[PDB]
Structure formats: C-alpha cells, structure tokens
Amino acid sequence: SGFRKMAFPSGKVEGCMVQVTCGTTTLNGLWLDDVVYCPRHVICTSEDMLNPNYEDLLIRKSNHNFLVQAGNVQLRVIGHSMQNCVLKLKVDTANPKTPKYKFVRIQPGQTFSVLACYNGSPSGVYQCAMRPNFTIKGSFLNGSCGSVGFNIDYDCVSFCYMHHMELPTGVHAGTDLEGNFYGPFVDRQTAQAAGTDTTITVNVLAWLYAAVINGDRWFLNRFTTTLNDFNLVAMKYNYEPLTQDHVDILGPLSAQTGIAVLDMCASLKELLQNGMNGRTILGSALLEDEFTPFDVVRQC
C-alpha cells in the first residue's frame, strides 16, 4: 500500500507568496487579502542585526521603503505595523487567490508542511515536525525567510509557522503568524543553542504501526509493559513520556492491526535497549518520529 513522508498540496499557499525587499535584504512574504506578512528582520542592516531595537528601527521607515513584488507586478504599500516578530504591510490590492485560512499555534510533536520559497518563488514542499525543543529540522537556505508552514483541513489552510533563522547546529527556528517564536529564540544575529531535544514517542509508535500495516513485524515481541514502566525507560533514552491521551490517539492503529498500544510500547522498549541489529524499518536505520498518528491513519 505504501508509506512515504507526505506533505499537503501546496497550491493554495503558492498563490500567496510574494517578494519583500527593504534596503539590500530580500525575503518572502505571505499575501492574504490586502495584507502581506513577513519577518521583521527585513528592516535590519548589518549595523542593527546584533541588538536591533525593532520599534525604534520601524518607526523610521516609510511605506515606500518596502518593495513588494507579486511576480511582474509591484504592490503599493499603504501602511505598515508590527505584531511581535512579524511585519504586516498593508497593500492597495487584494489577493484574489487568498484561500480560506486561519492562524494557529501548533504543539511540539505536531507536524506541518513547509513551502520553501526564495525571492517570492516557491521551490519545494516537505513535511516537518515541531520538535519538543521547538526547533524544526528544515531545509532552509539564505533567502528562505518568510516561508511558511501549514496544514489543510477540508479547503481551509491553517498557517502555523513562518521561517526566521538557522541555528549553529543546522536546525531552524521561527514564529507563528502572530510573530511569537516557537522556543527561546530571538531574531538577532547571534549564535543560539536550543534546549536538549527529545524524540516524539507517540510519533515513533505511530510509525511502528505504519510499518506493521505495510507488512513488516520483525520488531514485535511477545511482551507487554505498563505505561509507567515504559515511560521510565523512554525518559532514560531521552524519549518523551507517553500520556493517556497519546494512548487514546493510537486507538485506531491499535484496532486496525490488533496490536495493543502497550504491546507496541514493549516492542519499542526492546528496540531502545537492543538497537536494530543492522535491520531497518520502512527503509530507515533510525526510529522515525515525524509522523503523527493522524498522518499515518490518513495515508494508510
């Protein structure tokens, strides 16, 4: 039947991407109705990036300092304001391609699609998880800021992420569409470390169920565990504890496969203690934790 890391179709979001330039900085913006959202650090020069007093820098800007381009057309900025780390540019034109949309803040362990853009042009789409330490393992290069992450329920696009920066370890950080960072990060040009990351246990279990659904069971065993004994071992290996809500969420996969959640926990416990002995699961040598139970259900 198959299993691959699958993103939402990106077309509704592609119709909203524009280019925003201020000075010699260019990045992407999100054009909804008559407003363009983008990272506020577009207004910084080098002499500012190290400790930017954004309110003081922004009040010195005029509408005409912002060049917004949608393809071949320049949009006229008729006003601007700031919400946390996101700049909101009012334009004199409504985007006819505006989808039904909402702004959401996602929880660590939840997943979303990223539309990576450069110079206002979409380049790639891929699936990410909000890490427990509020980083994301993205593929973002110079010029990618303002790229957004999203989910689609029915015809509605829920925007949950806007891209701002890369950390020294190569992972990425950003904000929701209200401009609040995920995690303890700051939009200044400094080397920032994240909290210790952990593995998203409920997502690992969903992926093991996916592997069973696709006909692989080598990692199963005849044992079981209590929830607390599992969580003790999980935490020792820097895995997130599994809550009873997580257990409930795994119900449909448990029902579909006939493998009790706590039996799958006993399987994962053996994998954590014994490793994979060179084997692979669904093509992977590592336990994958960026598929949620909902993701697996939908795709299988």
Ligand X SMILES: *[C@@H](O)[C@H](C[C@@H]1CCNC1=O)NC(=O)[C@H](CC(C)C)NC(=O)OC[C@H]1C[C@@H]2CCC[C@@H](C2)C1
Ligand Y SMILES: *[C@@H](O)[C@H](C[C@@H]1CCNC1=O)NC(=O)[C@H](CC(C)C)NC(=O)OC[C@@H]1C[C@@H]2CCC[C@@H](C2)C1
- Contact residues toward a second copy (CB under 8 A) are 1-12, 14-15, 115-116, 122-128, 137-141, 166, 170-172, 214-215, 280, 283-286, 298-299
Pick between residue 31 and residue 140 the one whose CB is nearest to a second copy. Answer: 140
Pick between residue 242 and residue 296 the one whose CB is nearest to ligand X. Answer: 296
**In the complex, minimum distance from the CB of residue 284 to a second copy, in angstroms, rounded to a whole number:** 6
Q: Which does 61 bind (CB under 5 to 8 A by kind): a second copy, ligand X, ligand Y, none?
A: none
Pick between residue 147 and residue 231 the one whose CB is nearest to a second copy. Answer: 147
Q: Which of 16, 22, 38, 41 is catalytic?
A: 41
Token pair 């060179």 is found at: 278
Residue 126 backbone phi and psi in degrees, to 5: -155, 165
The SS3 call for residue 128 is strand
Per-residue burial over 174-213, b = 16 or more CB atoms within 10 Å of its CB, e = otherwise: bbbbebebbbebebeeeebebeebbbbbbbbbbbbbbbbb
The SS3 call for residue 61 is coil
Pick between residue 21 and residue 256 the one whose CB is nearest to ligand Y. Answer: 21
Catalytic (active site) residue 117? no
Which region, judged by CB under 6 A, interacts with ligand X, from 16-24, 158-166, 197-205, 223-231? 158-166
**In the complex, minimum distance from the CB of residue 103 to ligand Y, in angstroms, rounded to a whole number:** 21
- The 8 Å CB, 24+ separation contacts for 129-133 are 129/200, 129/203, 129/289, 129/290, 129/292, 130/106, 130/161, 130/182, 131/171, 131/197, 131/200, 132/108, 132/197, 132/198, 132/199, 132/200, 132/240, 133/108, 133/183, 133/194, 133/195, 133/196, 133/197, 133/198
Token pair 């493998």 is found at: 259
Residues facing residue 233 across a β-bridge: none
**Contact criterion met (CB below 8 Å) for 183 and 192:** no
Which region, judged by CB under 6 A, interacts with ligand X, from 117-125, 163-171, 211-219, 258-266? 163-171
Structural tokens at position 6: 């699958």
Q: Which does 8 bind (CB under 5 to 8 A by kind): ligand X, ligand Y, a second copy, none?
A: a second copy
Amino acid identity at 78: I
Instruction: Indicate which single residue of 8, 14, 34, 49 sits in contact with ligand X (rule: CB under 6 A).
Output: 49
Pick between residue 63 and residue 280 the one whose CB is nearest to a second copy. Answer: 280
Position with the least CB separation from ligand X = 145
Which region, judged by CB under 6 A, interacts with ligand X, from 79-87, 136-144, 240-248, 258-266? 136-144
Q: Who's near 75: CB < 8 A, 6+ residues apart?
A: 18, 31, 36, 68, 69, 91, 92, 93
Catalytic (active site) residue 41? yes
Q: Which does 5 bind (CB under 5 to 8 A by kind): a second copy, ligand X, ligand Y, none?
A: a second copy
Pick between residue 57 and residue 227 the one whose CB is nearest to ligand X. Answer: 57
The SS3 call for residue 298 is helix
Q: Which of 22, 38, 85, 145 is catalytic?
A: 145
The Cα 182–Cα 169 span in angstroms is 17
Which region, judged by CB under 6 A, interacts with ligand X, from 83-91, 116-124, 187-195, 225-233? 187-195
Site for ligand X in 228-267 (CB under 6 A): none
Residue positions annotated with a catalytic role:
41, 145
Applying CB under 6 A, the residues found at the interface with ligand X are: 27, 41, 44, 49, 140-142, 144-145, 164-168, 172, 187-189, 191
